[PDB]
Design a protein around this ligand. Structure first.
Ligand SMILES: Nc1nc(Nc2ccccc2)sc1C(=O)c1cccc(C(F)(F)F)c1
Length: 282
């Protein structure tokens, strides 16, 4: 490339290939994302203004030769790989707590600036050797607008609601919190209906009592099986009551009842939060 030198492919992103690259002029190592619309350019460019310790910095938006690339700060490893690497022993609770606290700070910051992620998953949560965790790709979904992982999708999205709210990110984070704890995905659906029914089998089929307006959602069907809610103590067993109470508030069916990132930061679960050093194999 004219302005960069590719080091290697990191993986397949939602919008195109993501490469580890080196800036020709500065020598800095970055995550270069090729995007496979003028409104998009202006919108994404606004995201360069976001700066928070728990948000992966969008360094630049490059539009040349009629191709679009996004330049992001490069982090050491993603949470998916770290969880896989920590499968035999599990991520220590203090580190799970630290990561959840930091992720909520990142969401609180973005949400306060009216920016949603909409597709949070372990793959876009990045960590470093110092104990920090950061979220990448906030705001891209709104700007770009559409195998895909459905495991972290909020129910309102699965039911076809075309209006998103900050609550979709809290749902995804709750799913990730559960996965760090149990070392297994909470709702590993293989299709949209399987994803929805896995949520229903665990949290109970929603109704107008727990979620006013659910029966009028676009893809809701009166024929959905009616499953009873499972005892929450069976869903993420290890986790103590503070952790379980917080998780339950992040997984409420009605997005309006779901706890905000700001309110979650004040939950008793974080009374003893610390910032441990992770054991990272790079
Ligand atoms: N900034 C940034 N640093 C990264 N370092 C890294 C280095 C080694 C292993 C894993 C991640 S990855 C990354 C992403 O922003 C990102 C987000 C979603 C998906 C992907 C991909 F999977 F590669 F398509 C990448």
């Amino acid at each position: 490339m004219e302005n960069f030198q590719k080091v290697e492919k990191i993986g397949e992103g939602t919008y195109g290939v993501v490469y580890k690259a080196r800036n020709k002029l500065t020598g800095e190592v970055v995550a270069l994302k090729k995007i496979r619309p003028s409104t998009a350019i202006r919108e994404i460019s606004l995201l360069k203004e976001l700066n928070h310790p728990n948000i992966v910095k969008l360094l630049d938006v490059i539009h040349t030769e009629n191709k679009l690339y996004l330049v992001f700060e490069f982090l050491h490893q993603d949470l998916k790989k770290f969880m896989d690497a920590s499968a035999l022993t599990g991520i220590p609770l203090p580190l799970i707590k630290s990561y959840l606290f930091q992720l909520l700070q990142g969401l609180a910051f973005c949400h306060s600036h009216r920016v949603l992620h909409r597709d949070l998953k372990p793959q876009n949560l990045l960590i470093n050797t110092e104990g920090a965790i950061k979220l990448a790709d906030f705001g891209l979904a709104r700007a770009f607008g559409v195998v895909v992982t459905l495991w972290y999708r909020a129910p309102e999205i699965l039911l076809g609601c075309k209006y998103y709210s900050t609550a979709v990110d809290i749902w995804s984070l709750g799913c990730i919190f559960a996965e760090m704890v149990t070392r297994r995905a909470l709702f590993p659906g293989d299709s949209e209906i399987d994803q929805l029914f896995r949520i229903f089998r665990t949290l109970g089929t929603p109704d107008e009592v727990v979620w006013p307006g659910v029966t009028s959602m676009p893809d809701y069907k009166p024929s959905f099986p009616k499953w009873a809610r499972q005892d929450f103590s069976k869903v993420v067993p290890p986790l103590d009551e503070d952790g379980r109470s917080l998780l339950s508030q992040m997984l409420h069916y009605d997005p309006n009842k779901r706890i905000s990132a700001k309110a979650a930061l004040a939950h008793p679960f974080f009374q003893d939060v610390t910032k441990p050093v992770p054991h990272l194999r790079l």
